[PDB]
Scaffold this active site. Structure first.
Site, PDB file in Angstrom:
ATOM      1  CD  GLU A 148     -52.937   5.897  29.534  1.00 29.99           C
ATOM      2  OE1 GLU A 148     -51.699   5.964  29.571  1.00 29.99           O
ATOM      3  OE2 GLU A 148     -53.648   6.303  30.468  1.00 29.99           O
ATOM      4  CG  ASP A 189     -53.102  10.901  36.199  1.00 26.78           C
ATOM      5  OD1 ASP A 189     -52.310  11.392  35.366  1.00 26.78           O
ATOM      6  OD2 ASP A 189     -52.949  11.109  37.423  1.00 26.78           O
ATOM      7  CG  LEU A 207     -51.691  15.478  32.286  1.00 21.82           C
ATOM      8  CD1 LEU A 207     -52.317  15.071  33.606  1.00 21.82           C
ATOM      9  CD2 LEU A 207     -50.174  15.400  32.349  1.00 21.82           C
ATOM     10  CG  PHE A 239     -49.639   7.973  25.616  1.00 23.74           C
ATOM     11  CD1 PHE A 239     -50.411   7.803  26.756  1.00 23.74           C
ATOM     12  CD2 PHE A 239     -50.246   8.488  24.476  1.00 23.74           C
ATOM     13  CE1 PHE A 239     -51.752   8.182  26.787  1.00 23.74           C
ATOM     14  CE2 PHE A 239     -51.577   8.865  24.493  1.00 23.74           C
ATOM     15  CZ  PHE A 239     -52.331   8.716  25.651  1.00 23.74           C
ATOM     16  CB  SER A 299     -33.755   0.994  30.554  1.00 23.96           C
ATOM     17  OG  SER A 299     -33.931   0.670  31.923  1.00 23.96           O
ATOM     18  CG  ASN A 349     -31.783  -1.036  33.978  1.00 24.65           C
ATOM     19  OD1 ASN A 349     -32.194   0.009  33.476  1.00 24.65           O
ATOM     20  ND2 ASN A 349     -30.882  -1.057  34.951  1.00 24.65           N
TER      21      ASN A 349
END
Length: 162
Positions: free
Chosen positions: A11, A20, A32, A104, A117, A132
């Site tokens: 990040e 972002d 965010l 996150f 998945s 996947n």
């Protein structure tokens, strides 16, 4: 390596409001602020989150404070989610960090939707899960980061963050 360092790598750290990868106003270590196109709306969220009139700029300590809250929230979201909790509990600590990283970035509801998945991860079919996971908007839009997270699920090591 640990989930905090892993997410700092993925990040970054920016002390002024920025957009972002999806174009949304953000600050700090991937905090965010809003999906609204209004910078004023983002600034209001920031002041509310920090507890002062920031005018769109924060300190490193303030960014780290929001980051710790956001990691905590990602873990809480996993543990309260009927689809994510059994997968999380089945994983070792390294792969748990990979799941936290996904939550996150995309949110609890988003990751919980990765039904096939998640099943492959629950089954410990690591190469299959990795294949996947890459068939996703996530992978296509952020391939370098998704590749690191997927490698972490595939191997159960931190090799992709070295």
């Amino acid at each position: 390596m640990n989930i905090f360092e892993m997410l700092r790598i993925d990040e970054g750290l920016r002390l002024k409001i920025y957009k972002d990868t999806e174009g949304y106003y953000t600050i700090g270590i991937g905090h965010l602020l809003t999906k609204s196109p209004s910078l004023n709306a983002a600034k209001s969220e920031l002041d509310k989150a920090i507890g002062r009139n920031t005018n769109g700029v924060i300190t490193k300590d303030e960014a780290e404070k929001l980051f710790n809250q956001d990691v905590d929230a990602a873990v809480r979201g996993i543990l309260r989610n009927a689809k994510l909790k059994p997968v999380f509990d089945s994983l070792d600590a390294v792969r748990r960090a990979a799941l936290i990283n996904m939550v996150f970035q995309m949110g609890e509801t988003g990751v919980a939707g990765f039904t096939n998945s998640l099943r492959m991860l629950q089954q410990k079919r690591w190469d299959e899960a990795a294949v996947n996971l890459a068939k996703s908007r996530w992978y296509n839009q952020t391939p370098n980061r998704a590749k690191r997270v997927i490698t972490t699920f595939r191997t159960g090591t931190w090799d992709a963050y070295k």
